[PDB]
Scaffold this active site. Structure first.
Site, PDB file in Angstrom:
ATOM      1  N   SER A  27      40.283 -25.237  22.779  1.00 54.18           N
ATOM      2  CA  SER A  27      39.883 -23.806  22.781  1.00 54.18           C
ATOM      3  C   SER A  27      40.922 -23.002  23.578  1.00 54.18           C
ATOM      4  O   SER A  27      40.559 -22.010  24.206  1.00 54.18           O
ATOM      5  CB  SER A  27      38.460 -23.608  23.258  1.00 54.18           C
ATOM      6  OG  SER A  27      37.870 -22.498  22.619  1.00 54.18           O
ATOM      7  N   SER A  56      34.949 -18.396  20.998  1.00 51.36           N
ATOM      8  CA  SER A  56      36.119 -19.108  20.503  1.00 51.36           C
ATOM      9  C   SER A  56      35.939 -19.703  19.105  1.00 51.36           C
ATOM     10  O   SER A  56      36.861 -20.333  18.630  1.00 51.36           O
ATOM     11  CB  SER A  56      36.564 -20.167  21.485  1.00 51.36           C
ATOM     12  OG  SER A  56      37.310 -19.570  22.546  1.00 51.36           O
ATOM     13  N   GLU A 101      42.171 -12.832  23.052  1.00 51.82           N
ATOM     14  CA  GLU A 101      41.591 -13.597  24.149  1.00 51.82           C
ATOM     15  C   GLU A 101      42.026 -13.017  25.492  1.00 51.82           C
ATOM     16  O   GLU A 101      43.217 -12.805  25.718  1.00 51.82           O
ATOM     17  CB  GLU A 101      42.065 -15.051  24.100  1.00 51.82           C
ATOM     18  CG  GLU A 101      41.466 -15.829  22.959  1.00 51.82           C
ATOM     19  CD  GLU A 101      40.075 -16.290  23.336  1.00 51.82           C
ATOM     20  OE1 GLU A 101      39.977 -17.302  24.039  1.00 51.82           O
ATOM     21  OE2 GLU A 101      39.126 -15.552  23.043  1.00 51.82           O
ATOM     22  N   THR A 157      33.716 -24.964  19.063  1.00 51.81           N
ATOM     23  CA  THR A 157      32.760 -24.307  19.922  1.00 51.81           C
ATOM     24  C   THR A 157      33.175 -22.874  20.266  1.00 51.81           C
ATOM     25  O   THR A 157      34.307 -22.476  20.100  1.00 51.81           O
ATOM     26  CB  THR A 157      32.618 -25.132  21.201  1.00 51.81           C
ATOM     27  OG1 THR A 157      33.893 -25.314  21.821  1.00 51.81           O
ATOM     28  CG2 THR A 157      32.051 -26.506  20.925  1.00 51.81           C
ATOM     29  N   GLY A 158      32.213 -22.130  20.792  1.00 51.74           N
ATOM     30  CA  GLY A 158      32.501 -20.950  21.591  1.00 51.74           C
ATOM     31  C   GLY A 158      31.461 -20.779  22.688  1.00 51.74           C
ATOM     32  O   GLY A 158      30.301 -21.087  22.478  1.00 51.74           O
ATOM     33  N   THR A 159      31.892 -20.230  23.833  1.00 57.86           N
ATOM     34  CA  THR A 159      31.008 -19.947  24.947  1.00 57.86           C
ATOM     35  C   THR A 159      31.406 -18.588  25.517  1.00 57.86           C
ATOM     36  O   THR A 159      32.583 -18.251  25.520  1.00 57.86           O
ATOM     37  CB  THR A 159      31.058 -21.069  25.989  1.00 57.86           C
ATOM     38  OG1 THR A 159      31.016 -22.333  25.312  1.00 57.86           O
ATOM     39  CG2 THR A 159      29.942 -20.944  27.005  1.00 57.86           C
TER      40      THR A 159
END
Length: 265
Positions: free
Chosen positions: A100, A42, A140, A209-211
């Site tokens: 996100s 993200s 996404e 952030t991204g995960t």
């Protein structure tokens, strides 16, 4: 040396770590695997909002977008509450950064227009900024697979750090648009355990952030020293060796950020 510390974090977390901090008047660049590719996850939602800000006047932020249940893809903490009412472009920008929100990001991509549901327009925007490395290929979706080694939907710590620096600190956006991006990132809700956790409380931190699977955990930030000196910090990580079900490790990003904070303080 610094590289040894990052390599030690890699050994301890069983992970691949990427770090970049652009050089400034006050610091040499920090780089570790900075030109290796890592999944965006993200983190693209921050420059996505910049693309949308850039391409439109700010009056565009009040445009009401409507959507249906069939647009809810992936974790969409905000958009899932407004299926009946819709959301403005500005509300979508807010959600895309601060929560996100995946649906918000897909609707912003749509708002960019052109092919690939906006992913080409987004990538072209990065190209425009001088980033010839990063690419977004895919919208996404919680159904997206993205195995290690595939260059799709990747950036590098070096490329994404230079992009974020232009956007928040540089001249890529006029000050009115720059201020909204900065503010959204400053009030992010997802980042407390990543770069924020590696910097002393007297530093300001804004971030995105991204995960992902394969232990993917990223954070991109702009930080300000207690004396007001800003730096861009990109830290990316994955654990491709542990397979699809490898656990992301936020603490890896916090501890990388601690190393960075040491060099900068």
């Amino acid at each position: 040396d610094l590289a040894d510390r990052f390599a030690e974090l890699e050994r301890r977390y069983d992970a691949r770590l990427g770090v970049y901090v652009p050089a400034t008047g006050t610091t040499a660049a920090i780089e570790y695997r900075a030109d290796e590719r890592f999944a965006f996850c993200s983190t693209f939602k921050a420059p996505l909002v910049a693309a949308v800000l850039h391409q439109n006047p700010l009056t565009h932020l009040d445009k009401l977008i409507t959507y249906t249940s069939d647009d809810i893809r992936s974790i969409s903490p905000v958009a899932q509450q407004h299926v009946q009412t819709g959301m403005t472009i500005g509300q979508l920008c807010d959600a895309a950064i601060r929560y996100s929100d995946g649906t918000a990001a897909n609707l912003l991509l749509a708002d960019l227009g052109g092919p690939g549901g906006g992913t080409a327009a987004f990538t072209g925007y990065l190209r425009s900024l001088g980033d010839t490395v990063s690419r977004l290929d895919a919208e996404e979706s919680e159904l997206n697979r993205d195995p290690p080694g595939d260059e799709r939907d990747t950036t590098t710590p070096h490329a994404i750090a230079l992009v974020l620096q232009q956007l928040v600190l540089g001249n890529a956006l006029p000050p009115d648009k720059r201020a909204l991006l900065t503010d959204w990132m400053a009030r992010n809700t997802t980042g407390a355990k990543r770069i924020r956790a590696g910097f002393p409380a007297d530093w300001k931190v804004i971030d995105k952030t991204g995960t992902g699977d394969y232990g993917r955990a990223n954070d991109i930030a702009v930080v300000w020293s207690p004396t007001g000196v800003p730096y861009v910090v990109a830290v990316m990580s994955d654990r491709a060796g542990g397979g699809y079900d490898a656990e992301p490790r936020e603490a890896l990003l916090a501890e990388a950020a601690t190393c960075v904070a040491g060099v900068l303080a």
